[PDB]
Amino acid sequence: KSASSFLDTFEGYFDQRKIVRTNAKSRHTMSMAPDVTREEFSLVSNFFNENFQKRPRQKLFEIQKKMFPQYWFELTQGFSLLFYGVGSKRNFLEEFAIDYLSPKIAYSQLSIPCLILNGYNPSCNYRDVFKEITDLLVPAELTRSETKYWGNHVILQIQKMIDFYKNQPLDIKLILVVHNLDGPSIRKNTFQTMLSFLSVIRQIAIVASTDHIYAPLLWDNMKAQNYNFVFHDISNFEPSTVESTFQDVMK
Amino acid sequence: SLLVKKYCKMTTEEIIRLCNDFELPREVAYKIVDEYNINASRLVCPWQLVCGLVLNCTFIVFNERRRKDPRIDHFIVSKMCSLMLTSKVDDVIECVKLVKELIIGEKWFRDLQIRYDDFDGIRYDEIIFRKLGSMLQTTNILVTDDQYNIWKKRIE
Amino acid sequence: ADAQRSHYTVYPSLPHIPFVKLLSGKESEVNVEKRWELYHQLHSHFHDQVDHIIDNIEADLKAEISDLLYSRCFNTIFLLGSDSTTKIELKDESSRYNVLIELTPKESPNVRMMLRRSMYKLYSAADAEENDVSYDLSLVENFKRLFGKDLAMVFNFKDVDSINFNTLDNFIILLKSAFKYDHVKISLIFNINTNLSNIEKNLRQSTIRLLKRNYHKLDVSSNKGFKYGNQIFQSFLDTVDGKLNLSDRFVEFILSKMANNTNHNLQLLTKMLDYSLMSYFFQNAFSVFIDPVNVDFLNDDYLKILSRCPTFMFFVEGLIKQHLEEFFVEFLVRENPINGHAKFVARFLEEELNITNFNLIELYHNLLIGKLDSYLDRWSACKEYKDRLHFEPIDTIFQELFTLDNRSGLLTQSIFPSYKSNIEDNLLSWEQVLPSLSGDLDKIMAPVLGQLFKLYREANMTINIYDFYIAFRETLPKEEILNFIRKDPSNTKLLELAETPDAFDKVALILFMQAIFAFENMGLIKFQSTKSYDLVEKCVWRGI
Amino acid sequence: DLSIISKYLLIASYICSYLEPRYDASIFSRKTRIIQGRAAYGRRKKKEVNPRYLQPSLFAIERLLAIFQAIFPIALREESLMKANIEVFQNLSE
């Protein structure tokens, strides 16, 4: 515990950066910590992740499923959804965008394909994802004049899709789901530029989540315009057992 | 002013009937006593903390009367300025919002907010739709229907 | 497993309106259809005028660029607040090819690449307008010998506040060498979003003297005299007039949020107005009565919640102290002419008085709050019309069901949330997010992230992770952990690990390591050393 | 033309670059202490060299937000200090 006077605001920030004397520093490591193997960590972790606080999470998820028509109404008006909160938002976005959103859009326009991105995976790439966007939306290929002089073909092709899709009917052809938009390979500038120019296209629905507490530093005013986010807090204290396998936990 | 006074030799009985002056039950009074007697060795002015504990507990214990009649929120804080010898009304709400930093994460205050069902001034079902960004939240522009029935009985 | 991929396509297996039933599930479906349709006529009526305003913005800006461009040195144009999206077009003038060459900082790693891309664009345009060449400035030298026409080059430097200034300086010095050719004239367009002096002190003084021979300045930004904001808001006032009125707190919310955005405040204004209209047509059941032909669709719930108005409160209290459906349906005809009065004082303000540097949103806010006179006591040229332009708002009855107001905190949660504050408040006061319904364990012990955050908030510079784990153990109770860990006899590994005498410390270490790396992924905590992993630094503080 | 948040973030960035973090609590701290504890004493000496003539120093985001909240211009449910919302981080990104 800190021997502080303040805890909140800059008052607790400046007051908690004390220059602690070297005589009052404890030399404690993991050497006298308990020795734990991998399998018992996995067993205890899955047991509390499937039993501890499970009834309040189930109840709370039963409240926040009532927000699904409001989310759909936000998506039809051109707003991208960004979800944030404490805990895993993987299962929420899968259930909303698969069980609910695609059948509702498909029946209202008379299923809709759902690309699902895993930003917790460090090997998520913009060129592979855009080749699949090409595979799903079949855009027209760039002319020689449209390639300029060693330009990025992905960005120029998406800009050509932007000034193609402005005169198409405004109906959702693709639902594009981004788990963990602020993970390691997905937070970089080119991939965010790609999704901003994709979010300009009204005919693609953008559903994304973030996990980092400093994540809104990723977007300047142009990118914030292009995303056009409506923010929604979904805090549920989930396990996050899928993303945790992509980091090393035994270290 | 008693808020200015420094290093007061607190006995238990004076804060016992200070808690008993404001209709607080015995449990929360003992929790306020035990909350003072841990932090007592490092207090600049203990009356700051005692007033903050008493008021921040009595807006939770008496919140059901607070939602019905608003003027009691203008009343009970005025029962500070009568007996704390303070002419300033900003100092006592400063006491409330500076004990709010020291009280928020603790277990007994947590259980008090559970058992009287008060979460920054409102019910749980109000704040779960306030945090979710619900459009269908009860916007505080209409008068309350319970208050409407109270005024209808006032006519009757 | 799909969870271990990077990206995958799912086609869900399928077996019509997102609006829901209001009045506690008693609203009829025809009212839902009317709400959806009427929201769509209001939304379409708003965005048609928004689209015409936007095309007028680009058309007038193109006109003034073409005016400033065509009426032995560069013709320099400094576009302040550019946020470059303009598609500049040039004249189809005979005996001289006019080529627009656009350059971005991504296309500018050095001078050689800038020259090569410029000459490739020049040759491509000159071939498309009517043997291979070298992509250097000698193509500019021999332009009349290869195409028979003069050359007019207009360089559009996009996002000059991102380009390397030494490279741009050397490219301008390179372009100076084409001034010895009689058939060449060069225009430069610099798209600036910071200041002129910022680029003036990142260029050498000889280049500044070069650019000073022929230079013009022009403001581009969306807050140029407010007239493009003032149109759009008035378009909203041309959409909602006679139907709903704006609240003063909603208008000052608009003012504060547009004062916080520099380059793009028009689209932020449109987004806030759209989301307010969405929230109204999703929340209120009285929005069917905006159409004046639905007045026969009143029920008991509509009158039951209709009577709970502060205006109806004051009216019936006054009529009781003096001495329902027909009273309601007749009082829906008044027009609320504050919008017409605001448009009238605007057209009076730039009709003859030549006052054009005003915000119509400020004027409408001061007209709403009744302090209009304090608003037009600033210009000191309209002193003669303090009674000609005077207006008193009339507080009508039950207008609080027909309004756009910001009091529930929905706009500031959906459009501009306190993001990191919400994260740390849901971490610290978790009982707020989680229901208060492992029956004996959930009442006693918090979720591990919340307890770990409460121990985290009360710590110093450097947290020793072993002692922090001990502080996490002492919060946990051993007895009901050992009771609940034996409440599933199917898994025998859990029972035999529970039988071990070091079970509680081990389980606490499982939960502690899981929660620590949860905080490390979220960014709250940091290992300062790549190896060892014996100490941590706090990154974030609550309430900043 | 530039925004009020971006101006005050530039002022806070300049303060963070050209002043030492250890003397922050002697300059910006103004809160009444319920808990006993001495604040920072301040610097004894004056520097021989102007720090503004030299290269700027490197700081963290949380320090910049703290000084920005300390220098930004201003009952029971008001909380007049401005917290780091979306617009602060968006202006920082610009």
- Provide the residue ranges of all domains of chain A, joining segments of one domain with +: 53-251
HSE (side-chain half, CA atoms, 13 Å) at C499? 6
CB A37 within 8 A of CB C481: no
Q: Which two tokens stand for residue C162?
A: 């991102």
Chain C contacts in chain B segment 87-116 (CB below 8 A): 104-105, 110, 113-114
Contacts of B78 (CB under 8 A, 6+ apart): B89
**For chain A, how big is the Rg over CA atoms in Å?**
22
Helix, strand or coil, per DSSP, at residue C7: strand
**Measuring CA to CA, which residue among D72, A222, D13 is closest to residue C193?**
A222
Say if the Cβ atoms of C544 and D69 lie within 8 Å. yes
Residue with tokens 């060459």: C101
**C-alpha pair distances (Å), C366 with each of A225, C252, C311, C325:** 29, 10, 22, 34
Q: Which two tokens stand for residue C251?
A: 């208008």
**Measuring CA to CA, which residue among B135, B138, B113, B112 is closest to residue B124?**
B113
Say if the Cβ atoms of C541 and A53 lie within 8 Å. no
D10 touches chain C (CB under 8 A): no
| Separation of alpha carbons A187 and A190, rounded Å | 9
With CA atoms as reference, the chain C residue closest to A50 would be: C438
Residue with tokens 């607080």: B24
Q: What is the dihedral of CA A172, A173, A178, A184, to 10 degrees?
A: -130
Give the 3-state secondary structure of C170-224: HHHHHHHHHHHCCCEEEEEEEEECCCHHHHHCCCCHHHHHHHCCCEEEEECCCCC
| Separation of alpha carbons B20 and B36, rounded Å | 16
**C-alpha pair distances (Å), A52 with each of A89, C432, C473, C511, D56:** 18, 18, 17, 11, 50
DSSP β-ladder status, A174-179 and C462-464? unpaired
Q: Which DSSP letter does residue A207 get? A: E
Q: Which two tokens stand for residue A1?
A: 């515990």
List, as own/partner pairs, every contact residues C352-359 make where C-beta atoms lie below 8 angstroms and the sequence separation is at least 24, other chains included.
Answer: C353/C381, C353/C382, C355/C379, C355/C381, C355/C382, C356/C225, C356/C227, C357/C225, C357/C226, C358/C226, C358/C230, C359/C226, C359/C229, C359/C230, C359/C255
* Bridge partners (DSSP) listed for residue C97: C151
* Bridge partners (DSSP) listed for residue C537: C462, C526
| Separation of alpha carbons C15 and C507, rounded Å | 45
Look up residue D73 and give its amino acid.
P
**Measuring CA to CA, which residue among A203, A199, A229, A180 is closest to residue A112?**
A203
Look up residue A28 and give its amino acid.
H
CB C76 within 8 A of CB C214: yes
DSSP β-ladder status, C150-157 and C184-192? parallel
With CA atoms as reference, the chain D residue closest to B55 would be: D76
Q: How far is C377 from chain B (nearest CA, A)?
A: 33
Contacts of C298 (CB under 8 A, 6+ apart): C325, C328, C329
Dihedrals phi, psi of C215, to nearest 5 degrees: -145, 145
Q: How far is D55 from chain A (nearest CA, A)?
A: 24
Dihedrals phi, psi of D68, to nearest 5 degrees: -60, -40
**Which residues from D are below 8 Å from B when comparing CB atoms?**
31-37, 75-77
| Separation of alpha carbons C495 and C349, rounded Å | 83
Residue with tokens 């009212």: C31
Look up residue C429 and give its amino acid.
S
Resolution (Å) of this entry? 2.7
Q: What is the dihedral of CA B18, B23, B29, B35, to 10 degrees?
A: -70
CB C363 within 8 A of CB C346: yes
Contacts of C520 (CB under 8 A, 6+ apart): C526, C527
List, as own/partner pairs, every contact residues C123-129 make where C-beta atoms lie below 8 angstroms and the sequence separation is at least 24, other chains included.
Answer: C124/A145, C125/C97, C125/C99, C125/C100, C126/C97, C126/C99, C128/A145, C129/C97
- What is the enclosing helix (H) or strand (E) of B125? helix B124-131
**C-alpha pair distances (Å), A193 with each of A219, A227, B27, C233:** 10, 10, 58, 30
Q: Is C91 exposed, middle or buried (0-12, 13-18, 19+ CB in 10 A)?
A: exposed
What is the count of residue pairs from A and C with beta carbons less than 8 Å apart?
276
D86 touches chain C (CB under 8 A): yes
How far apart, in Å, do the first and last CA atoms of chain A sit? 25
Helix, strand or coil, per DSSP, at residue C398: coil
Q: Please list the alpha-helical segments (H only) found in chain A.
A: 9-15, 38-51, 54-64, 68-76, 90-94, 102-108, 126-137, 153-165, 189-200, 221-227
Look up residue A54 and give its amino acid.
K
Look up residue C143 and give its amino acid.
F
CB A187 within 8 A of CB A217: no
Considering Cα of C257, then C261, then C266, then C268, what sign does the dihedral take? negative
Helix, strand or coil, per DSSP, at residue A230: strand
Q: What is the distance of C-alpha B37 from the center of its chain?
A: 20
Let me know how long chain B is: 156
**Measuring CA to CA, which residue among C540, C533, C541, C542 is closest to residue C468?**
C533
Residue environment code for A196-212, b if the CB has 16+ CB neighbours within 10 A, otherwise e: bbbbbbbebbbbbbbbb
Q: Please list the alpha-helical segments (H only) found in C335-434.
A: 338-349, 360-368, 372-376, 411-414, 419-428
Q: What is the distance of C-alpha C345 from the center of its chain?
A: 30
HSE (side-chain half, CA atoms, 13 Å) at B4? 5
The DSSP line for C434-469 is S----HHHHTTS--HHHHHHHHHHT--SEEEHHHHH
Dihedrals phi, psi of C331, to nearest 5 degrees: -90, 20
**C-alpha pair distances (Å), B130 with each of A36, C2, C22, C420:** 42, 34, 18, 16
Say if the Cβ atoms of C460 and A18 lie within 8 Å. yes
**Measuring CA to CA, which residue among A4, C429, C98 is closest to residue B118?**
C429
Q: Which two tokens stand for residue A193?
A: 């530029």
How many helices (H) and strands (E) chain B has is answered by: 9, 0
Q: How far is D80 from chain C (nearest CA, A)?
A: 12
Say if the Cβ atoms of A13 and D63 lie within 8 Å. yes
CB A109 within 8 A of CB A175: no
| Separation of alpha carbons C264 and B82, rounded Å | 53
Contacts of C393 (CB under 8 A, 6+ apart): C338, C367, C368, C370
CB C272 within 8 A of CB C254: yes
List, as own/partner pairs, every contact residues C29-38 make where C-beta atoms lie below 8 angstroms and the sequence separation is at least 24, other chains included.
Answer: C31/C285, C31/C288, C31/C297, C34/C288, C34/C291, C34/C294, C35/C281, C35/C287, C35/C288, C38/C281, C38/C287, C38/C288, C38/C290, C38/C291
Q: Which two tokens stand for residue C68?
A: 């400033």
Q: How far is C259 from chain D (nearest CA, A)?
A: 7
Look up residue C194 and give its amino acid.
T
Let me know how long chain A is: 251
With CA atoms as reference, the chain D residue closest to C220 would be: D1
| Separation of alpha carbons B77 and B81, rounded Å | 7
| Separation of alpha carbons C48 and C55, rounded Å | 11
Contacts of C342 (CB under 8 A, 6+ apart): C234, C237, C360, C363, C364, C367
